[PDB]
Design a protein around this ligand. Sequence first.
Ligand SMILES: CC(C)CC(=O)c1ccc(OC(F)F)c(O[C@@H]2CCOC2)c1
Ligand SMILES: [Mg+2]
Ligand SMILES: [Mg+2]
Ligand SMILES: [Zn+2]
Length: 326
Amino acid sequence: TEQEDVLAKELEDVNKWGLHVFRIAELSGNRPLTVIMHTIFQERDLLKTFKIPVDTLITYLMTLEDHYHADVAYHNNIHAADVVQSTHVLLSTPALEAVFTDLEILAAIFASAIHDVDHPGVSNQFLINTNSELALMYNDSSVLENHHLAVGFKLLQEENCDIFQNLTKKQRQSLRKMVIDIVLATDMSKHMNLLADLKTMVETKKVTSSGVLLLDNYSDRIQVLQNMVHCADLSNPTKPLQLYRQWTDRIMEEFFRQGDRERERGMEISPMCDKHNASVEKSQVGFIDYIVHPLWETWADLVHPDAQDILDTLEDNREWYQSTIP
Ligand SMILES: CC(C)CC(=O)c1ccc(OC(F)F)c(O[C@@H]2CCOC2)c1
Ligand SMILES: [Mg+2]
Ligand SMILES: [Mg+2]
Ligand SMILES: [Zn+2]
């Protein structure tokens, strides 16, 4: 109960950017995804709203969590938990108050939970280049992201795992489509097009009498949710530095392990995957400059000024990593 009370204490920070997610992973007995999802569902009253039996939720979450690979350094259950919690915070931004329905909120959070499930710790390109069963199944197109969806949905049909059992047929249909649209948008090959569309929305932005975003069609609604979960997926450099550095340690380990597999096969080693020739700090600065900051700056514009502190942290972290280079 002492460890249980300390875990309960930590989970009180679930509405905050910079939650101690690694501490939660250890305190929960390597069940960060389960406890964070359960906490968020309680916080948002989702069990009552969708008549989700508590035991069904926990059973599904435990099985979902099990299907993340404990031996993968970055794309594991802790990352899933982190993206879920980050999405949860982004959904609560003042500029979006009362914009999304309960079903849309459920879709975004569920999509976040399943978005990397059964990740093998290697990239789409590696899977394509090595003629893997996954690339063959999915015809080289969003290979992993299709797989994550397939696994996430299939696990609902396991014993006592259908958390959506009390949704209407129309609700289930809508949720399934939304979840697919969201998880496929986490494929980095879609990033530039997603960002271009987000910029267009920002430039043509409309707000209600309340000062909240006006979204009156599926296309705009789903686009915001896609970019939201994508922002959450790309949120590591916006977190307090002690968290960001741990995420960087993990992605580099994962990248280096892929590079070792490429080396052992006699393949050319992918960018940033050679442990004997890798500039970790320069690569983080490039990652921020070319990908993460352009996205988060546009998100910040969409919800201005709600995300200013997040954007400020990102800029501080870029400066920090940059400062280690000279
Ligand atoms: C979805 C995608 C961005 C996940 C990913 O590959 C990734 C996540 C966090 C990354 O870094 C840090 F945020 F943990 C990351 O960095 C690589 C290594 C240097 O630049 C690119 C990459
Ligand atoms: Mg596992
Ligand atoms: Mg992914
Ligand atoms: Zn991810």
